[PDB]
């Protein structure tokens, strides 16, 4: 058992689309009822942080997981503010510190390719849609699926973690199982990516149907 | 902080079924270099003898010492459900570390393999990307390879995802293979092959694909 902490950047969707970005500090592998863990937010500039939301949940594995989500200013983030999570506990050797700021370096917009699986024996009342988004940088990307131009619940699909392409960019796969009911009432699906380098409006999408 | 952790892998279905020379690997991460040596000890639950293992040490560009032991195992022994344990002996560790591994057991289900070529995208048109979705297999142990002209490419040429749960009972995986004009022009024949215990016969399922059919 080893307590670790993870500090996330805002989702490009939250940041560019909803324009209400948040960051999250995730603390894993805590021993329940060993008193409470303090999660403290701060800014490198020293300016005030918003009220954060804290979530605790005991895990099937006897772990305690704690998260704090902090809303951040769109301007502040995009302008390069640095945000720190500090994790405290009297029962804990040192204190834990993660920090986060907008990514740097060169940008490159995503290529988005969407594919339908051919009918495979057995369940023919199901197909799988898949999406390859690649050659973007930096690695921060949001993926979503739409049916009939309306966004599906995020739980409907699986998206992979950004892996390095053989070059300088990253790629990602998204998988979306669909039903006959769905593609029959309209065979229109969109894999949409949100990425800082996509112009304009940080969005790139690709349509795909079960039939060609 | 810094957490020494240990990982014990099952044999690759390729090694196991195709090369019929399976191995397991114990990986120990986040060691403090020159804190003396870490012992990695192999054992079998049946108490029968273990082969000679290979040990690899490498300081990482992050200051971490990484240690691995690879143990060759009997095909029969594995498939018959022998259990193998890695024991990790070290000073900076209060409790010794123990991982164990055995063949998986539960519902079997063969993989569905679908292969796709990316359309020509502006910029580099001397490159395409092949992609493969393998899904609905169980258990999660799978090998993926790409062939061009019926000959297997170097594993480094492609990226394969980690098995994720499908919405159902099975797993899926994606493989990505960038190709060159030189390659698909001299023959536009590529195969995504999976090796999986549930695939019959001969534990193999593959699918062909080409740049602009
Ligand atoms: C008890 O059981 C729980 C699960 O039920 C385990 O909790 C998990 O713990 C692991 C590791 O300790 C966590 O892994 C880390 O997750 C981070 C975020 O998770 C996802 O969700 C966010 C959005 O909330 C996404 O941004 C992200 O893509 C993930 O989908 C990752 O960011 C971590 O980083 C990984 O990639 C980076 C590359 O930048 C590497 O640096 C890291 O090394 C790593 O590869 C990492 O994946 C996991 O999040 C926890 N699950 C939950 C609840 O989300 C406990 O670990 C378990 N305890 C024991 C003893 O087993
Ligand atoms: C300092 O730098 C080193 C060197 O890069 C980092 O070491 C890596 O650390 C991670 C996590 O500790 C190791 O992850 C483990 O890899 C195992 C083997 O992976 C290889 O083989 C598999 C086949 O199983 C391939 O699919 C894969 O692409 C690799 O080729 C996996 O078996 C493990 O998977 C299990 O645990 C992870 C936990 O993250 C889960 O997400 C999985 O679902 C699964 O349960 C595991 O991922 C990695 O191998 C190390 N690299 C090596 C080989 O040295 C240090 O992490 C880094 N320290 C810092 C600063 O973070």
Swiss-Prot record, chain B:
GO terms for cellular component: extracellular region; extracellular space; IgE B cell receptor complex; IgE immunoglobulin complex; immunoglobulin complex, circulating; plasma membrane. Keywords: Adaptive immunity, Cell membrane, Disulfide bond, Glycoprotein, Immunity, Immunoglobulin, Immunoglobulin domain, Inflammatory response, Membrane, Repeat, Secreted, Transmembrane, Transmembrane helix. The keyword Repeat applies. GO terms for molecular function: antigen binding; immunoglobulin receptor binding. Residues 1-105, 111-210 form the Ig-like domain. Glycans are attached at residues 39, 51, 62. It comes from the Eukaryota. Disulfide bonds join 26-86, 132-192. GO terms for biological process: adaptive immune memory response; adaptive immune response; antibacterial humoral response; antibody-dependent cellular cytotoxicity; B cell antigen processing and presentation; B cell proliferation; B cell receptor signaling pathway; complement activation, classical pathway. The basic structural unit of both sIgE and mIgE molecules consists of two identical heavy chains and two identical light chains; disulfide-linked. N-terminal variable regions of the heavy and light chains form the antigen binding sites, whereas the C-terminal constant regions of the heavy chains interact with immune receptors to mediate effector functions. Constant region of immunoglobulin heavy chains. Immunoglobulins, also known as antibodies, are membrane-bound or secreted glycoproteins produced by B lymphocytes. In the recognition phase of humoral immunity, the membrane-bound immunoglobulins serve as receptors which, upon binding of a specific antigen, trigger the clonal expansion and differentiation of B lymphocytes into immunoglobulins-secreting plasma cells. Secreted immunoglobulins mediate the effector phase of humoral immunity, which results in the elimination of bound antigens. This is Immunoglobulin heavy constant epsilon. It comes from Homo sapiens (Human). The gene is IGHE. The chain holds residues 214 to 426 of 546 of the full protein.
């Amino acid at each position: 058992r080893c307590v670790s902490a993870y500090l996330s950047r805002p989702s490009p969707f939250d940041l560019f689309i909803r324009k209400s970005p948040t960051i999250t500090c995730l603390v894993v592998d805590l021993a329940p009822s060993k008193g409470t863990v303090n999660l403290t937010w701060s800014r490198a500039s020293g300016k005030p942080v918003n009220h954060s939301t804290r979530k605790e949940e005991k895990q099937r594995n006897g772990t305690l997981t704690v998260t704090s989500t902090l809303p951040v200013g769109t301007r502040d983030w995009i302008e390069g503010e640095t945000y720190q999570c500090r994790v405290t506990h009297p029962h804990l050797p040192r204190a834990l510190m993660r920090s986060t700021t907008k990514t740097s370096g060169p940008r490159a917009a995503p290529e988005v390719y969407a594919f339908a699986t051919p009918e495979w024996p057995g369940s023919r009342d199901k197909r799988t849609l898949a999406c390859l988004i690649q050659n973007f940088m930096p690695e921060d990307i949001s993926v979503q699926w739409l049916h009939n131009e309306v966004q599906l619940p995020d739980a409907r699909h699986s998206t992979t973690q950004p892996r390095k392409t053989k070059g300088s960019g990253f790629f990602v796969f998204s998988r979306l199982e669909v039903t006959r009911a769905e593609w029959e009432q309209k065979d229109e699906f969109i894999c949409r990516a949100v990425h800082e380098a996509a112009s304009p409006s940080q969005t790139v999408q690709r349509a795909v149907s079960v039939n060609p």
